Structure 1
Amino acid sequence: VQTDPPSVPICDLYPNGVFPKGQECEYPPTQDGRTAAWRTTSEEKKALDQASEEIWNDFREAAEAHRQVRKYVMSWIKPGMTMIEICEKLEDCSRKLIKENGLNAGLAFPTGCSLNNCAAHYTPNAGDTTVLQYDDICKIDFGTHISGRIIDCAFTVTFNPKYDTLLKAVKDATNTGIKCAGIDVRLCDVGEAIQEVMESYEVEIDGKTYQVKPIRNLNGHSIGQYRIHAGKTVPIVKATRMEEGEVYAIETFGSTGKGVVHDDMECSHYMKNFDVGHVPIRLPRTKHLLNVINENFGTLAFCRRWLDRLGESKYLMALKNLCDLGIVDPYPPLCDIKGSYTAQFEHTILLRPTCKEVVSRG
């Protein structure tokens, strides 16, 4: 049985090695009104689904770790805590439950804890004294993986009820996206549906009214093995189609600002360019850092805190060299206008030959 606080790896909770399935859904009907129900009983679709059972089983193990971590996070996340303490407590639990084992099992990307106007990609670097406030709107975005089968799942934390309708707008837009997604469904269609739902909401925060705006340059995406973004984008504002066997992160962002984000603040997130092959490096500090990245993260994203934890120091020039060489890409915090409020909800979905599985669903 799982301990309180959670410390038992998901692997040990399921001795048979069969991890729980997420929410299973029938695919949406076509424009003509033809149902996709036939996929569930098709012997050909069942054969194709069984052939990838090991892959879905890995996503399910990573999803169960994610559910247990986020249930744990919700029980203690409070204003007064430093952003570092929140991230380290969350990551310590995540490492234990995923049974972190080099590139075979672990953390898919750093824990995002972006606040207020900053929509995404903010994690504290060493020495960050930021403390979570009662009026903050915090986006907890973390990932787990088994054999590079990534769970990309996020939720928004608040303490003040004044943001309740903003959170509801974004949860409804995310659930709409999940519902509209399916094999042969256009990505532009999922995007238009998300926008229509989010914009139907009006909110009042400290005597000011706003229509909830989707963040036009933040989007959902396909997921590849050891690849957080596999090249297909799911817009969240108003003709490429989703394909069978694909995995998607369905995420939406709502804002009281412009509904557009720009790079801002100190960068904490970094990730090797997936398309860049072998690059010989002679520069000793740059060479060492790339070897550290290749061994510990490969093509998965990382943060400066994780380099500090690995015992690395005086690596900032080496890291900048890797960025300038195009081997590593920086992913700085993405912010809307000062004074604005942003919220996010995200799930990982499997486009299985038989059904659509919201593998990360709570």
Structure 2
Amino acid sequence: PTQQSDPPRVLISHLFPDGKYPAGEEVEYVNENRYRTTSEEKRYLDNMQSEFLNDYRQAAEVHRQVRKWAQGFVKPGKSLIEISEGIEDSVRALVGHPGLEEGDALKAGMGFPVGLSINHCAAHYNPNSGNKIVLQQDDVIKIDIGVHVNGRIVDSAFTMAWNDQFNPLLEAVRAATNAGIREAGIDARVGEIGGVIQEVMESYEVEINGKTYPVKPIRNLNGHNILPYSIHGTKSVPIVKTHDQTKMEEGDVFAIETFGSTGKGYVIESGEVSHYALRGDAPKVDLRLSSAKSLLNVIKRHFGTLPFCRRFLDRLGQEKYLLGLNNLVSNGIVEDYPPLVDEKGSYTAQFEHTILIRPTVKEVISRGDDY
């Protein structure tokens, strides 16, 4: 009767005609916070933020519908460019914002670049223009998609593979992410969550080419809280046990992500850079390159503090910007985020959800029937 298309092009509001988007997985807080579910005070407080919640849920439903398409489309033989462009075009169509006029991408659309990270690369790879890389049968790809509505950013990610030998690695990381999500809640201490994530993940091992490898958490990667128009707040959620005693609090939003690896369990920056973000705390700089000054205005007027990638500049007709972009990075105005890799020959996997720590309940807003 009324369904999404292939690829997704139907405005999400057409599929939810009352303008209300579905809640994600709602979980009661445990023990001394269980009173929150039925507390009239906390229910009224939660209801004050109905528009915030509904925007978050719109972004999460777009995320689900686009990743459903991706899960059916992405296979060996597809190019990274066509996958990324397919995801991006679907997100923008569903939210109704082409993101070409100044300010339009800041209303709704991509929350950050599409991560398409293969094998020993765990994160922060996105093809730049002219990229010709095609997925192979023995690849393990992490697809990290961000959707925002009015600056409410849903960050959720999953891994795909086509050779069954990798399945235990994917299962390990999915299980570890789900254990971290289960531990999350008001007053939970992030370093203790990390220990639970680690215990679950390290209970897995995977045989690759005749040798058995323990699955190791990537110890220098972590989840984080999410702020308006800003993917990273000040709080971290480690994926190993640490003595970070920071607590989750009412009103927080967290990206609970875990990464597992058959290699060292540690990543370094390596490879072509595609991902960038304007720092809200950028210092004052006497910019002399005309092209750094013009590029900064393009960035502020189109992306604000949302992360962007090179192709997001290319599609705005920017052609001579790499000098200026590197200058804004060197001057501390824009941060760069190079691809992150474990050792050559290793395989890494990622699963991630966004959770809302509401006054009443925990909402795993990006949960779907897929993961």
Q: TM class by shorter-chain length? A: over 0.9
1:310 aligns with 2:316: yes
Q: 1:130 corresponds to which residue?
A: 133
Deviation of the 1:278 alpha carbon: 6.4
- SS of residue in 2 equivalent to 1:94: helix
Q: 2:259 corresponds to which residue?
A: 253
Deviation of the 1:243 alpha carbon: 0.6
Structure 2 contact 278–306 (Cα < 8 Å) conserved: yes
Q: 1:46 corresponds to which residue?
A: 43
Q: 2:150 corresponds to which residue?
A: 147
Structure 1 contact 98–105 (Cα < 8 Å) conserved: yes
Q: 1:242 corresponds to which residue?
A: 248
Match 1:106 to one of 97, 105, 109: 109
CA RMSD of aligned residues (A): 1.2
Q: 1:66 corresponds to which residue?
A: 63
Q: 2:178 corresponds to which residue?
A: 175
Deviation of the 1:104 alpha carbon: 1.1
Where does structure 2 lack aligned partners over 5 or more consecutive residues? 98-103
User: Which amino acid in structure 2 is aligned with residue 171 of structure 1?
Assistant: R
CA distance in 2, matches of 1:231, 1:293: 23
Comparing 332-341 and 204-213, the one that deviates more: 204-213
Structure 1 contact 98–144 (Cα < 8 Å) conserved: no
Deviation of the 1:129 alpha carbon: 1.5
Match 2:196 to one of 183, 193, 196: 193
Comparing 6-15 and 138-147, the one that deviates more: 6-15
- SS of residue in 2 equivalent to 1:140: strand
Q: 2:18 corresponds to which residue?
A: 16
Percent identical among aligned pairs is 59
CA distance in 2, matches of 1:298, 1:342: 31
Structure 1 contact 135–158 (Cα < 8 Å) conserved: yes
Q: 1:288 corresponds to which residue?
A: 294
The TM-score normalised by the length of structure 2 is: 0.94
Where does structure 1 lack aligned partners over 5 or more consecutive residues? none
Alignment: residue pair count: 357
Deviation of the 1:274 alpha carbon: 2.3
1:225 aligns with 2:231: no
CA distance in 1, matches of 2:166, 2:348: 10
Cα-to-partner distance string for 1:46-97 (whole Å, 9 max, x where unaligned): 1110111111111100000000000011111111111111111111111111
Cα-to-partner distance string for 1:85-140 (whole Å, 9 max, x where unaligned): 11111111111112223311110000011000000000011122211000000000
CA distance in 2, matches of 1:143, 1:200: 30
Flag the 1:237–1:91 CA change in 2: closer, same or farther, 3 A: same
1:184 aligns with 2:187: yes
CA distance in 1, matches of 2:28, 2:283: 40
Q: 1:355 corresponds to which residue?
A: 361
- SS of residue in 1 equivalent to 2:266: coil
- SS of residue in 2 equivalent to 1:189: helix
User: Which amino acid in structure 2 is aligned with residue 257 of structure 1?
Assistant: G
CA distance in 2, matches of 1:304, 1:140: 18
Cα-to-partner distance string for 1:242-293 (whole Å, 9 max, x where unaligned): 1101100000000000000000001000001122266564532111100110
User: Which amino acid in structure 2 is aligned with residue 102 of structure 1?
Assistant: A
- SS of residue in 1 equivalent to 2:154: strand
Structure 2 contact 261–346 (Cα < 8 Å) conserved: yes
The TM-score normalised by the length of structure 1 is: 0.96
